[PDB]
Structures are given as structure tokens and as C-alpha cells.
């Protein structure tokens with residue numbers, strides 16, 4: 393039992409700690425995650441912003457910092473993916489570990505879809521195969537993800553049909569999947585996410601994968617008690633770590649939305665500003681206000697994250713029941729939900745589910761409301777400007793003038809519900825155009841990123857390019873455009889196609 397424990401279980405610990413990355417390879421925690429995600433996706437999503445003016449001449453104004461943007465790639469390929477691959481190799485042919493094989497595959501897709509959604513082309517289907525060209529196009533990576541999820545759900549279903557105990561996954565549960573069936577439900581929900589991601593570029597694939605996701609007999613996540621979220625084995629939530637450094641402020645777009653909707657999640661997510669004369673208001677930091685080291689930290693008294701809500705021991709949310717309902721709402725809106733359920737029913741279930749996750753009460757009154765997001769007013773000192781609210785849609789689903797506005801409601805509410813996880817939020821914003829994030833006030837991208845289109849991706853890792861110039865060339869070829877922040881990823885068509 394102990395030889396097998398060291399053989400299999402430790403790999404699962406590294407992988408699960410390495411998704412919302414806070415894996416300690418020997419040099420500490422928190423600080424890697426800060427560049428992995430917090431100074432990229434979490435800001436670009438509109439959720440969060442730092443206060444330090446020393447950073448305000450970098451990512452916030454689209455002058456992308458090479459060391460920061462490479463981090464998701466570097467940390468994942470250095471420490472996490474090779475372990476997921478090893479775990480695949482040692483379980484795929486093991487008669488008694490079909491469940492661990494299934495779980496490995498699901499975690500591998502969970503980790504790596506976040507990387508392709510950041511950069512585009514990645515190394516995935518050809519990893520460890522020593523082929524001439526190691527690179528998957530994003531389309532090829534997505535197809536490999538769907539294939540891996542098929543293999544996973546097959547393996548776990550076989551494990552159960554052969555008489556494997558539901559709780560045989562107990563020793564590897566750091567993601568709130570205590571049974572084999574719950575891993576399959578995780579896979580089904582993740583497949584639905586990926587299906588909606590590809591719905592604008594490849595409706596045929598989206599349709600077939602959504603059908604598989606929503607007809608699989610093990611179900612999808614419907615209750616917040618089953619949310620996929622990381623905890624255990626000494627894992628600490630790195631968002632709480634960065635909050636402890638004083639660096640996680642509310643973003644202007646989420647302040648606009650939550651204030652205008654009079655959203656009861658507002659005080660759960662954030663605290664009121666400490667700025668004099670504004671101490672009962674929620675104030676969000678506008679992205680792209682230029683400043684540099686030596687300047688005052690103009691936004692230091694804006695609203696901060698709620699550190700009773702987000703603590704070191706708080707599980708790190710990855711995939712929620714609420715999100716799953718909003719995915720079903722979109723599938724219904726697109727006519728590709730095999731279940732007999734409407735977009736409205738799913739939308740309202742998503743909002744109610746999100747309220748319940750956070751303890752915000754019942755959503756019935758909110759779902760009838762006519763609140764509109766509020767304008768951004770620059771109360772801070774410095775060169776910031778006021779901005780008129782770009783989002784005009786209400787929480788009431790019936791107040792849509794067309795189905796594009798219905799999709800906007802679904803995605804905007806999904807964005808509230810995915811908080812604080814900036815990667816899913818940012819990916820969906822790029823994919824759908826929603827929510828309508830405030831644009832950067834200053835764009836120092838040297839023409840590589842368009843203010844109105846907004847940032848589309850992160851550039852490839854130059855640390856990897858220096859190790860492997862041929863691979864960098866291959867990644868660039870697979871991207872089909874310039875390696876900068878303005879090139880659309882494969883799933884980003886620039887419009888919603890029904």
C-alpha cells in the first residue's frame with residue numbers, strides 16, 4: 393500500500409496544487425501565482441487590479457511585461473504538465489487504476505485548456521513523443537481535450553461497472569470529487585465548457601460535444617456543494633496570499649456591474665472603499681491609467697477584496713454549478729442543448745445557484761430587477777478619466793431586445809458567478825465580447841493591441857523561445873498571425889455566430 397501511495401498519489405497532489413498554481417518547487421508560494429495569473433488574467437478579466445504605480449507602465453496599459461506574460465506557460469511546463477503526463481503513463485495500462493487514469497486525464501485537460509486559452513498553440517497531443525513538430529494548433533489541442541475526456545469518462549465508467557468502489561478515489565481528492573461518479577460529472581461539465589468555447593468557430597463540434605456532455609448518464613454539476621475547487625494537503629489559496637500583500641483591489645467594471653445591479657454579492661466579494669468621503673461606496677480601479685515607479689499609488693484607497701471571504705484556507709474555485717447552468721443557458725439559446733430546458737430557466741437557475749454558493753440569499757427579486765451598471769468616476773488623484781458604463785443590460789432575462797442581448801445577460805451573469813477565477817472570465821470575455829469591460833485609458837502596446845478590440849491573448853513564452861527557437865517558429869506558424877497580444881485565438885471569431 394505504501395509503495396503504491398508513493399507511486400500514484402503524490403503526482404495527484406502536485407497536479408491539483410498546480411492548476412490555480414500554488415505549488416512549492418523549493419522557492420516558496422504566492423509570488424509565482426502572482427505572475428501566473430494575478431497580474432495577467434485576473435486584471436484583464438476586469439475582476440482585480442494592483443495599487444502599485446510601479447506596475448502601471450506595464451500590463452495595465454498593454455505594455456506587456458515578458459516575464460509576467462510567460463509565467464502560466466513556464467510554471468505549467470516546468471512543474472505540472474510533466475507530472476500529469478507521467479501520471480498518464482503509469483496508470484493508462486494499470487488494470488486496478490482505471491479510476492486514477494480517468495482522474496489524471498480530467499485534471500490534465502483542466503490544467504491545459506487554461507494554457508491554450510492564454511497563448512493559442514501549445515504542446516499537448518505530441519508531448520513526450522519526440523516528433524519533428526511538437527506543436528498543436530489550438531483546434532488540435534481542443535480535439536485532443538475532447539478525446540481525453542472521452543477516454544476519461546470511459547475509464548471511470550468501466551471502473552464502476554467492474555465493481556470498483558465509488559470511494560476508490562478518496563486518496564486523490566483535492567478537487568471536491570469524492571467518488572468516481574463525481575469525477576465523471578466534473579468531466580461532463582468541463583466538456584460542456586469546452587463545447588461552448590468552440591461554438592462560434594465550430595458549431596458542429598460544439599453541438600456534438602454539448603450533446604455528449606448533457607446526455608451522459610452521470611450528469612453535470614448542478615449544486616454548489618459539488619463545485620470543483622482545490623483544497624487539502626497543505627495547499628494555500630494564493631489569492632489570499634496576494635491579498636495579504638495588499639495587492640488585490642476591485643476592478644472598475646465589476647464595481648460598475650455590482651453597484652448598478654445592487655447585487656447582494658458586492659459586499660461578499662469586496663469591501664467598501666477607504667477613500668475619504670467615499671467610505672460607504674464600492675470603487676473599482678480603472679485599467680490602463682499610466683503611472684510609473686515614484687508616482688503616488690493613486691488607487692490605494694479604492695475597494696479591496698473581502699479577506700473574510702477569501703482566506704488561505706478557502707478552496708480555490710475552478711468550475712461551479714452556477715457556471716454549468718449558464719453554459720446550459722447558452723446551449724439552449726444556440727439550439728444545441730439536448731435537454732428539454734429553456735435559456736431562461738437555465739439562466740435563472742445559474743443566478744440562484746451563484747447566490748446560494750456565496751450565501752447571498754434568494755435571487756427571485758434580483759431576477760426581476762431593472763438596475764443598470766453605473767458609470768466610473770475617477771475620485772482618485774492622478775491622470776485617470778471618468779468612463780460612461782458600457783453595459784446597459786439589466787439582470788432581468790425578459791428585458792432582452794434580441795438574443796444577442798440574451799447571450800450578453802448569460803455571459804455577464806456567468807462572469808459574476810465565476811469570480812474570483814480570472815482565467816475562465818477572461819477567456820469568455822474574449823470569446824463572446826461579454827461582459828463589456830471598460831477599455832484601457834492609455835494603450836502603450838506600440839500598435840500591437842487595439843484599444844476597442846482589446847487584448848486577445850498573451851504572447852508566447854520568450855523563456856521557452858530562447859531554449860527552443862524551432863519550437864517558437866512552429867508555435868508562431870500554428871498561431872496564424874503575429875505573436876503579440878492583438879492576434880485572435882482560433883475560438884475567437886470576433887462575433888457570436890448562431
Ligand code: NA
Nearest residue numbers: 842843844845
Ligand atoms: Na476601431
